[PDB]
Amino acid sequence: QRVEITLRSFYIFNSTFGQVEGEEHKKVLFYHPNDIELNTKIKDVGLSEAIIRFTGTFTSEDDCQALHTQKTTQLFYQPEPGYWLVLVLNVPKEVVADYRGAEISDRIYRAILRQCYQMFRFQNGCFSSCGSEEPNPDKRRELLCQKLLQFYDQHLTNLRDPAQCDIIDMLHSIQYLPLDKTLFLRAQNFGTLCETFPDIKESIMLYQEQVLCGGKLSPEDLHCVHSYVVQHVLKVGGFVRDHPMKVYVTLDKEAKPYYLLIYRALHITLCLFLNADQVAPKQDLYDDLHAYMAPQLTSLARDISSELTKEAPKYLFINEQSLQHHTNFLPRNVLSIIADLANAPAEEVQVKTTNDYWIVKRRCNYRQYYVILCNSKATLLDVTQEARRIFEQELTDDVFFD
Amino acid sequence: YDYQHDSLWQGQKKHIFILSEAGKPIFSLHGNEDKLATLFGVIQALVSFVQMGQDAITSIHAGGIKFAFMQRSSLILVAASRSNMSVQQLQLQLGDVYNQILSILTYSHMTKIFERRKNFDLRRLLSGSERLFYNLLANDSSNNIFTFLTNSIRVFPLPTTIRSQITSAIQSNCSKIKNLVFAVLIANNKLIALVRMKKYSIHPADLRLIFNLVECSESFKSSENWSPICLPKFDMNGYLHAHVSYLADDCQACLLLLSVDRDAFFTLAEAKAKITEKLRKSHCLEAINEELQQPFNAKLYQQVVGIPELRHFLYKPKSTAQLLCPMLRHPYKSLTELERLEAIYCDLLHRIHNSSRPLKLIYEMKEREVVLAWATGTYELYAIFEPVVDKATVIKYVDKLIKWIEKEYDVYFIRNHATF
Amino acid sequence: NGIHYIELTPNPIRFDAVSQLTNVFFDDSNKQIFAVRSGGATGVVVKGPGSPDDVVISFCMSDRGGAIRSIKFSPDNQILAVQRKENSVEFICFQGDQPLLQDIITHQVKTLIHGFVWVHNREVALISNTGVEVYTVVPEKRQVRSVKSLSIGIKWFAWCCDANVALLCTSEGNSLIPVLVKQKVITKLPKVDLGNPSRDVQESKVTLGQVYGVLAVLILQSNSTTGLMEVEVHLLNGPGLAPRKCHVLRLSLLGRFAINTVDNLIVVHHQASGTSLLFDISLPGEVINEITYHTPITPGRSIKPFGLKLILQCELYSTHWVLFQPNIVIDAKLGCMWFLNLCIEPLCQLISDRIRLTEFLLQRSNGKQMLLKVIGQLVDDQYKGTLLPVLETIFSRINKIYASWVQLELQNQTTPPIVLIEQLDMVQIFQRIARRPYTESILMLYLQSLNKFNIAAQEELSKMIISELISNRSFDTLRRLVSYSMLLESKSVACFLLSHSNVDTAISQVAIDMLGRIEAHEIIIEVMLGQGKVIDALRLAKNSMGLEKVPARKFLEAAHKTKDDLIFHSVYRFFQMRNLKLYETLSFPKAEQCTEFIQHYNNTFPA
């Protein structure tokens, strides 16, 4: 019998509140399994705070990262001064009850724990900004608790399976979309909507689940928009919808509120951003936009589909500046080794696993290249040319200078 | 003593604490344990709280410091490091300290002394032996840390006939003596000859304990010595009595005769006198002294000079616990780069021997080094080369080096240990 | 002042006024004004079209013979030809500027003679009732001889100069026939088509002219269904030289008419109203039965009144105005010769539709400047969000004639269009609107317009696109454009892109990729040395250059400035090993100038 990694608890706390005796239960802002008795809820926070206090003797309290134990593994994160997010896991077991906790990589789960906070901030803002109208400093926390419950009773349910995690989860990568010269320019021509309608501040396009035109937005904001649209529109021909949805992104100087509008034309999704200081738009804008955009988007999405329909070693190439990857994706140990090797001058690593697997890694110009050869026993001399053939077929230009 | 406001105390690169389950200080590497009393209370509180949930603390990871915990037999051990070492190596270090504690005091005596009465002060019994703990934990960062990382000792280079003559003298002069279980000859922290009794084998940990004891004491040259010593792996519930003495003034070789009977001082003294007379007559002290007077080996130095792109390497056969390593040279004379060399070796050793993800061959091309780590069914090899070398030359250099070692094996390595 | 777009030239050509002692004759092949003076022994005055100071040739010999009805000169001012009787045409030698005539050449014709033309430099063709004859004249024997002839009944003839084509009638029926006359060559051409029931036609209706390099016949007709007038156009652009009807011109007025050509435009004059109308063949229109029907491009208007300083203004649209097929006006009483010109600046206001104005201006001699001005006005001052499709079509109207010319000039084996606009001309206009929010939408539209017709981008356009994209922070478009190779790959573009590496690292990434594609390793090496990656630069230079060509002083100096001993050891051992491989020793050659590094190494690493 074998058991894989399973989630146990996820909680958020701040230790400043609850100083007065008899009200120590105010520090708990969110505990995931709600059926747990409050006494059991207090002790976890107590143990965590004890760990931060113990670490604070030598180094700073902000540097506490993880806690390892025979049966669990606890991970910490501090987004803002005072507030802490903690995630608790269960180690794999093989049956004498042997535990295999050494197979857990903390970086993947820390990245997941960061994605959680980023997804919260995208729609609601910082923890310290909620309820800014109330002057009473005690009633402000109730609104924060309500917002946390509403968001995290639906976010955690739709979480990805912990047993399956790879480099792509660590690195926030989206696949590349090959396309030709004319259709890309036709798609880019739709950014001229600003001149006709001066309210629009930005527009982005998606083809199915891949990016076609990103525009001005930063990669992290684009990833957030992609994740929301994938998990709330596609999986669940006109506008999808009275004040529209409000989101928080940064375009010029700082993060500001905006109204997000979503339009679907077959397999093309268009996201439009409007200002949030003024009044919500009326029906005339919707009617005009629909009557102006109905035929052209459908024609383009019908042409791209026709173009796409007409047209053992494994490889994975990743770009760090744009966060996009090209691959054709192996036992668990190989993937764990690739996770260990992932991360700056140039380098070159060749590694042979005990089960006859060759892994070749190179880095050059903010990019990473992985080639995996399997079921082949070859000496160290031949693997270089075997990798060079693959680096030649898939890369049009050679940047390694032979 | 506000230890939270002392930058010098917090800035050290290794801390080791040994305490009891009730919060009583026993051992601290830096600073008096009296003024560090709140910290031990905090440690005990953490350990007990986590243990009450039917689970045990293993480690703690922070931004720039790691902590490792251990608990056996009413004792708590904590190790804190700022270096590149992983948790398992710190656990091995803690096991070494525990083995030292059991070497000074028998396991049964400690178990009885805690079972009969708790809240006992163990400093009183562990008194006058701080040298054996300070010396053992000072092998950090001019190189015995390789011995600890690879868990293997170094052998004294000599022609095979001289070694056979020494072994023959020891066997012939020490045959009638009963209950004589080991006989060890050590010179300049290097093994020369070891004769054992059948059905008994020396374990690396005990052999390293003997080396540590011989290195720590300085009164062993003054006169003939008689002391008790406990070998944990051999027997955790008794003492073996040692007859310890140097060979002579001209040759600084230390001979240890370990026995189980208490009343054997004079017989072993006569055996020592006969042995040293026999070696003096057969021209064996001369070779030892000539080798000691030299600063470094000749043949190995010439072989390394013959390869102008090799800076350092480590070799260890799998069958036996022994090591071969050359002398440090100019590019790694300073400490600031010795630390980086140690970090490289630690990372390679961890990567090769990982249980979940075992590896078999590593080749890396970095900015300052070209590193190779090979693990086969007979040997292991860890080599460092210049950064602007080509790949097709490393292979031939490695091949010629291994071919030379395969023919000079008998001068640097001992295959089978002699028996009485 | 009003608005007028058809004008007379400021400087007329003045000659002797008409009277009871003088007459006027005109030859349009050389534009010669002929006047007589009976005060003397029949003196003459001959004037020229473009001579600033034309000494009039006064020959005063013709005294007997009767009345004159034809005067002509040879194309090189060598032989003079006159006609003095209904059945005789005579020739006079003209050496220098004086006649020297003793016996003059004469000739006889069976029927009454209509006219004669100078077909080439030394012979004359005569048209008489019987038909057409050709005669060659030389003065060395004072005799003329025939070469070829043909016999067809003739009522009246029409002549042209450029194409050497004559248009002739028949006495059998109301039919028109073309003919070609050249060097001993006479060729007949198929007749003009009017209708199976033969229909008559008069002299005032038929004209022959040149339009866009093709000879055309214009005939005025009135419809049966409606009393309005039209002009039928027959063009000689058929197999060989054969007539096909192609165009019909509409006027919707009644009265007298006159047709002229002004800068490849067909102009119709009217008297009762006081207006002149313009039509262009090339512009489109209603198309039925492979025939295009045309309407005036602007409402009717008049000619700018002209004043003279004998200011006393002169009358217009008089009775003695005589209009020739090209732009010539001759007046009887005044005695003046005028040319007609066009003003385009007023037309740039009446034609409000911009696409039609562009099509009208792309086929004119001086339409480049005005077209550039209107494009500048659209892009700079009067920009609106709904003007972009207009700009798209305007750009498509230029890039087609750009691509056709480039492709036709590309062909090789071993007349450019009237207005051609290239990238260098448009970039100068785009410069004045730099650093504004609406600049990217124009540049990308132009790039797409170039893309459709397979024209590659050049340097300065790529520079401007890069600058705008960087300023507006659009990196994905830049990556995709450099991936598709829509920007010229050159050292100037790569260096310009690298000069903007301080804003962000993606610009540096793109610059290094472009430098790698065009294989410029020196700049990459210098960049890595500036950053501090000396050993990577050395590794690259080992492959780019040889092993015996890598310099030693520069890399050692960089390692010394790095203030790290291990890198110094690495470079020193590299060069020591190179010396050992080459010269079989570990000693630096004296000519290498490395005396300081040896001492520094010995002071840092002691033996």
PDB file of N, CA and C in Angstrom, chain A residues 176-182 184-186 188-189 192 195-196 211-216 251-252 319-322 345-346 365-367 396-397 399 401, chain C residues 383 385 388 438 440-441 444 448 451 472-477 479-481 484-486 504-506 508-509 512-513 516-517 521 524 533 536 540 543:
ATOM      1  N   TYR A 176       3.587  28.216 -26.325  1.00  0.00           N
ATOM      2  CA  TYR A 176       3.689  29.109 -27.470  1.00  0.00           C
ATOM      3  C   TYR A 176       2.648  28.757 -28.530  1.00  0.00           C
ATOM      4  N   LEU A 177       2.211  29.774 -29.272  1.00  0.00           N
ATOM      5  CA  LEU A 177       1.254  29.601 -30.368  1.00  0.00           C
ATOM      6  C   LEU A 177       1.890  30.018 -31.687  1.00  0.00           C
ATOM      7  N   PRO A 178       2.347  29.077 -32.509  1.00  0.00           N
ATOM      8  CA  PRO A 178       2.853  29.444 -33.835  1.00  0.00           C
ATOM      9  C   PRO A 178       1.750  30.003 -34.720  1.00  0.00           C
ATOM     10  N   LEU A 179       2.135  30.933 -35.587  1.00  0.00           N
ATOM     11  CA  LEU A 179       1.193  31.622 -36.457  1.00  0.00           C
ATOM     12  C   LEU A 179       1.969  32.226 -37.620  1.00  0.00           C
ATOM     13  N   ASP A 180       1.237  32.647 -38.648  1.00  0.00           N
ATOM     14  CA  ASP A 180       1.851  33.190 -39.847  1.00  0.00           C
ATOM     15  C   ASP A 180       1.824  34.720 -39.827  1.00  0.00           C
ATOM     16  N   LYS A 181       2.348  35.311 -40.901  1.00  0.00           N
ATOM     17  CA  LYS A 181       2.628  36.743 -40.922  1.00  0.00           C
ATOM     18  C   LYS A 181       1.350  37.567 -41.036  1.00  0.00           C
ATOM     19  N   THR A 182       0.441  37.175 -41.932  1.00  0.00           N
ATOM     20  CA  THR A 182      -0.715  38.013 -42.242  1.00  0.00           C
ATOM     21  C   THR A 182      -1.756  37.985 -41.129  1.00  0.00           C
ATOM     22  N   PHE A 184      -1.406  37.350 -37.935  1.00  0.00           N
ATOM     23  CA  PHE A 184      -0.963  38.079 -36.751  1.00  0.00           C
ATOM     24  C   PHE A 184      -1.199  39.574 -36.904  1.00  0.00           C
ATOM     25  N   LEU A 185      -0.896  40.127 -38.080  1.00  0.00           N
ATOM     26  CA  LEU A 185      -1.130  41.548 -38.302  1.00  0.00           C
ATOM     27  C   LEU A 185      -2.617  41.875 -38.300  1.00  0.00           C
ATOM     28  N   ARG A 186      -3.439  41.002 -38.890  1.00  0.00           N
ATOM     29  CA  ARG A 186      -4.884  41.203 -38.834  1.00  0.00           C
ATOM     30  C   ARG A 186      -5.379  41.221 -37.393  1.00  0.00           C
ATOM     31  N   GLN A 188      -3.554  41.961 -34.670  1.00  0.00           N
ATOM     32  CA  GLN A 188      -3.020  43.148 -34.015  1.00  0.00           C
ATOM     33  C   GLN A 188      -3.763  44.413 -34.415  1.00  0.00           C
ATOM     34  N   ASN A 189      -4.376  44.437 -35.600  1.00  0.00           N
ATOM     35  CA  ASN A 189      -5.102  45.628 -36.027  1.00  0.00           C
ATOM     36  C   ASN A 189      -6.293  45.963 -35.137  1.00  0.00           C
ATOM     37  N   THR A 192      -6.818  49.139 -32.445  1.00  0.00           N
ATOM     38  CA  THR A 192      -7.205  50.481 -32.852  1.00  0.00           C
ATOM     39  C   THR A 192      -8.577  50.877 -32.308  1.00  0.00           C
ATOM     40  N   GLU A 195      -9.060  54.572 -30.497  1.00  0.00           N
ATOM     41  CA  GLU A 195      -9.322  55.834 -31.184  1.00  0.00           C
ATOM     42  C   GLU A 195     -10.811  56.049 -31.436  1.00  0.00           C
ATOM     43  N   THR A 196     -11.540  54.991 -31.794  1.00  0.00           N
ATOM     44  CA  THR A 196     -12.974  55.140 -32.028  1.00  0.00           C
ATOM     45  C   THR A 196     -13.731  55.332 -30.718  1.00  0.00           C
ATOM     46  N   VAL A 211      -2.166  32.555 -25.581  1.00  0.00           N
ATOM     47  CA  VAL A 211      -2.127  34.000 -25.780  1.00  0.00           C
ATOM     48  C   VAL A 211      -1.851  34.303 -27.245  1.00  0.00           C
ATOM     49  N   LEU A 212      -2.622  35.227 -27.811  1.00  0.00           N
ATOM     50  CA  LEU A 212      -2.454  35.672 -29.188  1.00  0.00           C
ATOM     51  C   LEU A 212      -1.977  37.113 -29.282  1.00  0.00           C
ATOM     52  N   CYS A 213      -2.508  38.006 -28.445  1.00  0.00           N
ATOM     53  CA  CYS A 213      -2.030  39.381 -28.352  1.00  0.00           C
ATOM     54  C   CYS A 213      -2.124  39.823 -26.900  1.00  0.00           C
ATOM     55  N   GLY A 214      -0.975  40.126 -26.297  1.00  0.00           N
ATOM     56  CA  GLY A 214      -0.910  40.531 -24.906  1.00  0.00           C
ATOM     57  C   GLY A 214      -0.868  42.032 -24.714  1.00  0.00           C
ATOM     58  N   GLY A 215      -0.095  42.720 -25.527  1.00  0.00           N
ATOM     59  CA  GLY A 215      -0.098  44.180 -25.530  1.00  0.00           C
ATOM     60  C   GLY A 215       0.898  44.756 -24.531  1.00  0.00           C
ATOM     61  N   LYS A 216       0.386  45.512 -23.558  1.00  0.00           N
ATOM     62  CA  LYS A 216       1.206  46.271 -22.626  1.00  0.00           C
ATOM     63  C   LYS A 216       1.316  45.638 -21.244  1.00  0.00           C
ATOM     64  N   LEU A 251      -0.656  49.571 -14.600  1.00  0.00           N
ATOM     65  CA  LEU A 251      -0.318  49.848 -15.991  1.00  0.00           C
ATOM     66  C   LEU A 251       0.736  50.938 -16.121  1.00  0.00           C
ATOM     67  N   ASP A 252       0.496  52.128 -15.567  1.00  0.00           N
ATOM     68  CA  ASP A 252       1.435  53.237 -15.693  1.00  0.00           C
ATOM     69  C   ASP A 252       2.358  53.359 -14.484  1.00  0.00           C
ATOM     70  N   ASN A 319      11.635  30.194 -21.744  1.00  0.00           N
ATOM     71  CA  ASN A 319      12.103  31.574 -21.776  1.00  0.00           C
ATOM     72  C   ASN A 319      11.765  32.234 -20.445  1.00  0.00           C
ATOM     73  N   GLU A 320      12.745  32.919 -19.855  1.00  0.00           N
ATOM     74  CA  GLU A 320      12.550  33.504 -18.533  1.00  0.00           C
ATOM     75  C   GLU A 320      11.947  34.901 -18.596  1.00  0.00           C
ATOM     76  N   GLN A 321      12.193  35.644 -19.676  1.00  0.00           N
ATOM     77  CA  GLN A 321      11.714  37.020 -19.746  1.00  0.00           C
ATOM     78  C   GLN A 321      10.219  37.085 -20.041  1.00  0.00           C
ATOM     79  N   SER A 322       9.716  36.178 -20.878  1.00  0.00           N
ATOM     80  CA  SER A 322       8.311  36.177 -21.261  1.00  0.00           C
ATOM     81  C   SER A 322       7.507  35.053 -20.628  1.00  0.00           C
ATOM     82  N   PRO A 345      25.544  33.327 -15.402  1.00  0.00           N
ATOM     83  CA  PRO A 345      26.323  33.022 -16.606  1.00  0.00           C
ATOM     84  C   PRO A 345      25.933  31.658 -17.171  1.00  0.00           C
ATOM     85  N   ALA A 346      26.637  31.262 -18.229  1.00  0.00           N
ATOM     86  CA  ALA A 346      26.325  30.025 -18.925  1.00  0.00           C
ATOM     87  C   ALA A 346      26.836  28.814 -18.148  1.00  0.00           C
ATOM     88  N   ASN A 365      21.310  33.166 -22.300  1.00  0.00           N
ATOM     89  CA  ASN A 365      20.492  34.312 -22.699  1.00  0.00           C
ATOM     90  C   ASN A 365      19.069  34.209 -22.147  1.00  0.00           C
ATOM     91  N   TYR A 366      18.983  34.150 -20.816  1.00  0.00           N
ATOM     92  CA  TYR A 366      17.707  34.124 -20.099  1.00  0.00           C
ATOM     93  C   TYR A 366      16.803  32.995 -20.586  1.00  0.00           C
ATOM     94  N   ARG A 367      17.397  31.841 -20.875  1.00  0.00           N
ATOM     95  CA  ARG A 367      16.642  30.698 -21.364  1.00  0.00           C
ATOM     96  C   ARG A 367      17.223  29.422 -20.776  1.00  0.00           C
ATOM     97  N   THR A 396      15.837  26.788 -34.860  1.00  0.00           N
ATOM     98  CA  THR A 396      16.235  27.211 -36.199  1.00  0.00           C
ATOM     99  C   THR A 396      17.657  27.761 -36.209  1.00  0.00           C
ATOM    100  N   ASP A 397      18.022  28.534 -35.189  1.00  0.00           N
ATOM    101  CA  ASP A 397      19.335  29.152 -35.095  1.00  0.00           C
ATOM    102  C   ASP A 397      20.086  28.583 -33.899  1.00  0.00           C
ATOM    103  N   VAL A 399      22.629  29.133 -30.925  1.00  0.00           N
ATOM    104  CA  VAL A 399      23.168  30.188 -30.076  1.00  0.00           C
ATOM    105  C   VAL A 399      24.334  29.708 -29.228  1.00  0.00           C
ATOM    106  N   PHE A 401      27.100  28.543 -30.521  1.00  0.00           N
ATOM    107  CA  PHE A 401      28.305  28.741 -31.329  1.00  0.00           C
ATOM    108  C   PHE A 401      29.067  27.428 -31.507  1.00  0.00           C
TER     109      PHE A 401
ATOM    110  N   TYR C 383      -6.594  65.038 -37.916  1.00  0.00           N
ATOM    111  CA  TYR C 383      -6.744  63.626 -37.595  1.00  0.00           C
ATOM    112  C   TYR C 383      -8.020  63.381 -36.802  1.00  0.00           C
ATOM    113  N   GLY C 385     -10.587  59.780 -35.492  1.00  0.00           N
ATOM    114  CA  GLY C 385     -10.516  58.344 -35.311  1.00  0.00           C
ATOM    115  C   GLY C 385     -11.154  57.542 -36.423  1.00  0.00           C
ATOM    116  N   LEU C 388      -9.030  56.392 -40.632  1.00  0.00           N
ATOM    117  CA  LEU C 388      -8.021  55.378 -40.931  1.00  0.00           C
ATOM    118  C   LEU C 388      -8.311  54.550 -42.184  1.00  0.00           C
ATOM    119  N   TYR C 438      -0.874  58.455 -31.300  1.00  0.00           N
ATOM    120  CA  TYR C 438      -1.521  57.814 -32.441  1.00  0.00           C
ATOM    121  C   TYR C 438      -0.548  57.514 -33.578  1.00  0.00           C
ATOM    122  N   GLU C 440       1.736  54.767 -33.694  1.00  0.00           N
ATOM    123  CA  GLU C 440       1.916  53.344 -33.969  1.00  0.00           C
ATOM    124  C   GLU C 440       0.884  52.829 -34.967  1.00  0.00           C
ATOM    125  N   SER C 441      -0.369  53.270 -34.830  1.00  0.00           N
ATOM    126  CA  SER C 441      -1.442  52.793 -35.694  1.00  0.00           C
ATOM    127  C   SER C 441      -1.225  53.149 -37.158  1.00  0.00           C
ATOM    128  N   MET C 444       2.180  50.803 -38.381  1.00  0.00           N
ATOM    129  CA  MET C 444       1.859  49.395 -38.593  1.00  0.00           C
ATOM    130  C   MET C 444       0.939  49.203 -39.793  1.00  0.00           C
ATOM    131  N   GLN C 448       1.782  46.891 -43.047  1.00  0.00           N
ATOM    132  CA  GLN C 448       0.877  45.895 -43.617  1.00  0.00           C
ATOM    133  C   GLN C 448       0.630  46.152 -45.100  1.00  0.00           C
ATOM    134  N   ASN C 451       3.450  44.867 -46.854  1.00  0.00           N
ATOM    135  CA  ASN C 451       3.484  43.410 -46.792  1.00  0.00           C
ATOM    136  C   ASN C 451       2.612  42.780 -47.869  1.00  0.00           C
ATOM    137  N   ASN C 472       6.294  53.082 -26.225  1.00  0.00           N
ATOM    138  CA  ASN C 472       4.986  52.677 -25.725  1.00  0.00           C
ATOM    139  C   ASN C 472       5.022  51.368 -24.947  1.00  0.00           C
ATOM    140  N   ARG C 473       6.196  50.754 -24.792  1.00  0.00           N
ATOM    141  CA  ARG C 473       6.367  49.499 -24.057  1.00  0.00           C
ATOM    142  C   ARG C 473       5.494  48.384 -24.637  1.00  0.00           C
ATOM    143  N   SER C 474       5.786  48.035 -25.886  1.00  0.00           N
ATOM    144  CA  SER C 474       5.172  46.901 -26.573  1.00  0.00           C
ATOM    145  C   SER C 474       6.302  45.963 -26.979  1.00  0.00           C
ATOM    146  N   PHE C 475       6.575  44.968 -26.138  1.00  0.00           N
ATOM    147  CA  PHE C 475       7.692  44.064 -26.373  1.00  0.00           C
ATOM    148  C   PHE C 475       7.286  42.804 -27.126  1.00  0.00           C
ATOM    149  N   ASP C 476       6.052  42.328 -26.939  1.00  0.00           N
ATOM    150  CA  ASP C 476       5.604  41.136 -27.652  1.00  0.00           C
ATOM    151  C   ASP C 476       5.558  41.376 -29.156  1.00  0.00           C
ATOM    152  N   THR C 477       5.057  42.542 -29.573  1.00  0.00           N
ATOM    153  CA  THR C 477       5.031  42.870 -30.995  1.00  0.00           C
ATOM    154  C   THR C 477       6.439  42.963 -31.563  1.00  0.00           C
ATOM    155  N   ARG C 479       9.133  41.335 -30.449  1.00  0.00           N
ATOM    156  CA  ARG C 479       9.642  39.973 -30.552  1.00  0.00           C
ATOM    157  C   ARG C 479       9.062  39.262 -31.766  1.00  0.00           C
ATOM    158  N   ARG C 480       7.759  39.424 -32.002  1.00  0.00           N
ATOM    159  CA  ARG C 480       7.132  38.749 -33.131  1.00  0.00           C
ATOM    160  C   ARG C 480       7.567  39.344 -34.466  1.00  0.00           C
ATOM    161  N   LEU C 481       7.839  40.650 -34.515  1.00  0.00           N
ATOM    162  CA  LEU C 481       8.305  41.260 -35.757  1.00  0.00           C
ATOM    163  C   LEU C 481       9.730  40.832 -36.083  1.00  0.00           C
ATOM    164  N   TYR C 484       9.677  37.242 -37.412  1.00  0.00           N
ATOM    165  CA  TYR C 484       9.237  37.095 -38.795  1.00  0.00           C
ATOM    166  C   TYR C 484      10.177  37.759 -39.792  1.00  0.00           C
ATOM    167  N   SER C 485      11.206  38.461 -39.316  1.00  0.00           N
ATOM    168  CA  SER C 485      12.187  39.133 -40.169  1.00  0.00           C
ATOM    169  C   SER C 485      11.533  40.219 -41.023  1.00  0.00           C
ATOM    170  N   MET C 486      10.789  41.104 -40.365  1.00  0.00           N
ATOM    171  CA  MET C 486      10.209  42.266 -41.021  1.00  0.00           C
ATOM    172  C   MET C 486      11.043  43.524 -40.845  1.00  0.00           C
ATOM    173  N   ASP C 504      15.248  48.267 -20.276  1.00  0.00           N
ATOM    174  CA  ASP C 504      14.843  46.944 -19.823  1.00  0.00           C
ATOM    175  C   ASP C 504      15.758  45.908 -20.463  1.00  0.00           C
ATOM    176  N   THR C 505      15.725  44.693 -19.912  1.00  0.00           N
ATOM    177  CA  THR C 505      16.596  43.615 -20.368  1.00  0.00           C
ATOM    178  C   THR C 505      16.089  42.914 -21.625  1.00  0.00           C
ATOM    179  N   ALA C 506      14.786  42.979 -21.911  1.00  0.00           N
ATOM    180  CA  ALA C 506      14.263  42.332 -23.112  1.00  0.00           C
ATOM    181  C   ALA C 506      14.857  42.950 -24.371  1.00  0.00           C
ATOM    182  N   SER C 508      17.887  44.155 -24.597  1.00  0.00           N
ATOM    183  CA  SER C 508      19.214  43.557 -24.707  1.00  0.00           C
ATOM    184  C   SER C 508      19.141  42.136 -25.254  1.00  0.00           C
ATOM    185  N   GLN C 509      18.147  41.362 -24.813  1.00  0.00           N
ATOM    186  CA  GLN C 509      17.983  40.000 -25.315  1.00  0.00           C
ATOM    187  C   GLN C 509      17.747  39.997 -26.822  1.00  0.00           C
ATOM    188  N   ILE C 512      20.985  40.988 -28.720  1.00  0.00           N
ATOM    189  CA  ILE C 512      21.974  39.916 -28.789  1.00  0.00           C
ATOM    190  C   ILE C 512      21.531  38.839 -29.772  1.00  0.00           C
ATOM    191  N   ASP C 513      20.232  38.528 -29.805  1.00  0.00           N
ATOM    192  CA  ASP C 513      19.743  37.560 -30.785  1.00  0.00           C
ATOM    193  C   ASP C 513      19.987  38.042 -32.213  1.00  0.00           C
ATOM    194  N   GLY C 516      23.596  37.792 -33.101  1.00  0.00           N
ATOM    195  CA  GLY C 516      23.963  36.417 -33.390  1.00  0.00           C
ATOM    196  C   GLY C 516      23.531  35.972 -34.773  1.00  0.00           C
ATOM    197  N   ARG C 517      22.338  36.390 -35.207  1.00  0.00           N
ATOM    198  CA  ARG C 517      21.844  35.955 -36.513  1.00  0.00           C
ATOM    199  C   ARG C 517      22.717  36.469 -37.653  1.00  0.00           C
ATOM    200  N   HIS C 521      30.424  38.800 -33.969  1.00  0.00           N
ATOM    201  CA  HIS C 521      30.886  38.335 -32.668  1.00  0.00           C
ATOM    202  C   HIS C 521      31.725  39.363 -31.918  1.00  0.00           C
ATOM    203  N   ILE C 524      29.476  41.286 -29.532  1.00  0.00           N
ATOM    204  CA  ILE C 524      29.083  40.425 -28.418  1.00  0.00           C
ATOM    205  C   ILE C 524      30.225  40.291 -27.420  1.00  0.00           C
ATOM    206  N   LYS C 533      31.861  39.341 -17.787  1.00  0.00           N
ATOM    207  CA  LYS C 533      31.979  37.912 -18.079  1.00  0.00           C
ATOM    208  C   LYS C 533      33.182  37.678 -18.993  1.00  0.00           C
ATOM    209  N   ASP C 536      33.721  33.840 -20.365  1.00  0.00           N
ATOM    210  CA  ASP C 536      32.814  33.511 -21.460  1.00  0.00           C
ATOM    211  C   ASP C 536      33.241  34.201 -22.750  1.00  0.00           C
ATOM    212  N   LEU C 540      34.299  32.297 -26.215  1.00  0.00           N
ATOM    213  CA  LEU C 540      33.757  32.636 -27.528  1.00  0.00           C
ATOM    214  C   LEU C 540      34.859  33.037 -28.504  1.00  0.00           C
ATOM    215  N   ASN C 543      36.707  30.213 -30.339  1.00  0.00           N
ATOM    216  CA  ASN C 543      36.056  29.636 -31.511  1.00  0.00           C
ATOM    217  C   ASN C 543      35.962  30.635 -32.660  1.00  0.00           C
TER     218      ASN C 543
END
